[PDB]
Design a protein around this nucleic acid. Structure first.
Length: 690
RNA sequence: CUUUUUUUUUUUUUU
């Protein structure tokens, strides 16, 4: 039996008086009996014990609590915003009712009436033990330990790719359905679409320039293009061109409401959930080569060291000549003084030659190198962990093998100019409208648990400092490197260092009072926004509208500073849910590859020792498994610590008794060899020492 | 009714 809620007027009175504290609930996955909300001060988080004192609140919901008299303990007394999707995936069992158990251990256990269950489930239920179901919570009583739910549908067989993919898509709230006819009725009509003739005067015509895009090979939507031209005085004219999406998305139409509802596109291993209809996403706005397109552009005149001497914003019309990749661009970067033959090059428009593209990407790389060096001298921080990419089968969709996604120079050449374009646009739209502008901000990391990393790195002979961000980056660069063990050292230390960092936020400039909170911590800039990808995000469409209002092409936005804050608040959770969905898609496909590729042999580094287990990080792939002594064939094992440094001694079992048993020493940053083997569970495997 | 063990894994760029 729980406790009833209190009135909204009493919530407001006690929240203004100061007896109640609001905050976002976080629920421990490994032990569901405890919950945490962040403190408004910042000293230590607020504890909520039990399931009863959580009071029907779910993970991610923004609740209001009251502290018990005496870590400080509180109980949930009200819920303002229900931020959880209230849906789950799981299994149906039997005990008037039937039991539903979700896979997630934070979601409670659900009663479903047998009217919702299918017609042959009550008799012979043995075949419905590996069937995935989607169930939605609709009501939870004050006197029931179990929620009441409605069964949506049957997903499929548990352990497959598409039932689990659609289940994890549905559990986070990603709308992966199709667009209604009231959305496609706002699209432009006429299959051979052409540019209207009144737009040859309000936009600048750059059809004769050398214009190119550099994008991955498995990409159908293109959001940006680049151009470089050498001047006659040793300078460069560099132009960045962004697809004009806001011309095709008017304000107030249902297309704009749908694009604001699904605030971003979700990219998975096998497919993509878009933001716009396929016409706008793939033909009209996506800058395919050999076609005239309407863009919105920023053009600079830069020195060879990359210093701004001129700036011009404005709407233009381009015609791209080629579509390069990240592999051809590396070929022309790494062949500076040799003509690459045309057999290994993509097709190009006949108006231009490959010499122009070759010298253009050489000049852009030359500017981008100096921009990188100046940005990291200035104090930018970059904590890059390891990401892997799979190779699929064209007839069944199963993975064949995974490789390591390498961050080459062509991913930096684009990134420097995109950061330059965002840095220009943020300054322009902040000096134009100081009370309505959409910008990003990164808070400084938490002071409480950065100190724990300080006392951890005080030991173990590691000379790092966390006084700033550029100091942290220069310390992680200039301590160890260029080895086979030092790179694993770098990976384990980066994995520990990325834990106290906060998450970046969209915000409106008319609600924060001081300019200290406008700062972006990791790039070390005072102003930042997103502008260069309007097909993938809706915040860039908002920035396009604001900058077109700032340039005098249209009237000022008629939206309040609270509407922009609400839209940014929606975009933040949409981005977070999208990132979580791609993480689980990567985990799903790796588990499928492990099960269908036998045991996998790799090396690992120990990053944590417990009494009966220790945690490794697999170097070849990038996952963090746990190894238990119960699965080991040892004679004995002993745990020691001296100077707060853990120590594990393993005494193995010899194959013959006429020989002294071997010894194994396990401490932090130790290189071991492991093998990954799937087990009888559908989506589970284990790591075992070899 | 629920895991072979105390929460926080982030930033940037392109898909």
């Amino acid at each position: 039996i729980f406790e009833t809620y209190m009135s909204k007027e009493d919530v407001s009175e006690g929240l203004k008086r100061g007896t109640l504290i609001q905050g976002v609930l976080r629920i421990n996955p490994k032990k569901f009996h405890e919950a945490f909300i962040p403190s408004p001060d910042g000293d230590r988080d607020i504890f909520i014990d039990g399931v009863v004192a959580r009071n029907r609140a779910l993970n991610g919901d923004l609740v209001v609590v009251k502290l018990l008299p005496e870590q400080r303990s509180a109980k949930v007394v009200y819920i303002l915003e229900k931020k959880h999707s209230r849906a789950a995936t799981g299994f149906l069992k039997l005990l008037k009712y039937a039991l539903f158990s979700p896979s997630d251990h934070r979601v409670p256990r659900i009663y479903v009436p047998l009217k919702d269950c299918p017609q042959d489930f009550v008799a012979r239920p043995k075949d419905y033990a590996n069937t995935l179901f989607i169930c939605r919570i609709v009501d939870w009583k004050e006197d029931c330990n179990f929620a009441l739910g409605q069964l949506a549908k049957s997903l499929g067989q548990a352990g497959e790719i598409e039932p689990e993919t659609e289940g994890i898509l549905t559990e986070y709230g990603v709308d992966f359905s199709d667009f209604s006819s009231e959305v496609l009725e706002c699209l432009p009509q006429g299959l051979p679409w052409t540019i209207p003739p009144e737009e040859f005067s309000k936009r600048r015509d750059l059809r004769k320039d050398c214009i190119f895009t550099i994008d991955p090979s498995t990409a159908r939507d293109l959001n940006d293009a680049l151009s470089c031209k050498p001047l006659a005085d040793g300078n460069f004219k560099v132009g960045v061109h962004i697809a004009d999406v806001s011309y095709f998305v008017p304000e107030g139409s249902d297309l704009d409401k749908v694009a604001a509802e699904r605030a971003t596109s979700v990219y998975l291993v096998q497919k993509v959930v878009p933001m716009l209809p396929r016409l706008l996403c793939e033909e009209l706005c996506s800058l395919n080569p050999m076609s005239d397109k309407l863009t919105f552009s920023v053009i600079w005149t830069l020195t060879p060291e990359g210093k701004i001497l001129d700036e011009w914003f404005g709407r233009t019309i381009i015609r791209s000549c080629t579509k390069l990749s990240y592999e051809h661009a590396q070929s022309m970067i790494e062949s500076p003084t040799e003509k690459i033959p045309a057999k290994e090059l993509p097709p190009i428009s006949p108006e231009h030659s490959s010499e122009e593209v070759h010298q253009a990407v050489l000049n852009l790389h030359g500017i981008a190198k100096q921009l990188r060096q100046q940005r990291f001298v200035d104090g930018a921080l970059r904590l890059d962990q390891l990401k892997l990419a799979f190779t699929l089968d064209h007839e069944t969709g199963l993975p064949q093998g995974c490789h390591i996604y390498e961050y080459r120079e062509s991913n930096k050449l684009v990134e420097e100019f995109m950061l330059l374009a965002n840095m220009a646009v943020a300054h322009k739209i902040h000096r134009a409208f100081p009370e309505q502008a959409l910008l990003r901000r990164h808070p400084p990391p938490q002071t409480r648990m950065l100190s724990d990393l300080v006392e951890f790195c005080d030991q173990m002979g590691l000379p790092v400092d966390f006084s700033s961000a550029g100091a942290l980056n220069k310390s992680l660069t200039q301590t160890f490197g260029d080895d086979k063990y030092s790179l694993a050292r770098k990976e384990v230390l980066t994995n520990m260092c990325s834990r106290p960092m906060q998450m970046a936020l969209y915000f409106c400039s008319g609600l924060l009072q001081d300019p200290a909170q406008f700062r972006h911590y990791a790039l070390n800039v005072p102003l930042y926004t997103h502008f260069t990808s309007p097909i993938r995000r809706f915040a860039d469409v908002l920035v396009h509208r604001l900058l077109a209002a700032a340039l005098g092409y249209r009237e000022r936005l008629d939206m309040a500073p609270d509407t922009l804050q609400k839209q940014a608040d929606h975009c933040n959770d949409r981005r977070m849910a999208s990132k979580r969905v791609q993480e689980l898609s990567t985990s799903l496909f790796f588990a499928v590859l492990v099960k269908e590729s036998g045991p996998l042999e790799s090396e690992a580094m120990v990053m944590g020792i417990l009494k009966q287990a220790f945690d490794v990080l697999v170097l070849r792939y990038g996952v963090q498994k746990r190894i238990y002594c119960n699965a080991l064939a040892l004679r004995s094992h002993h745990f020691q610590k001296v100077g707060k440094k853990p120590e594990l001694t393993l005494v193995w079992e010899p194959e013959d008794m006429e020989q002294e048993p071997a010894q194994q020493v396990i401490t932090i940053f130790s290189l071991v060899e492991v093998v990954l083997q799937a087990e009888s569970t559908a989506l589970k495997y284990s790591a075992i020492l070899k």
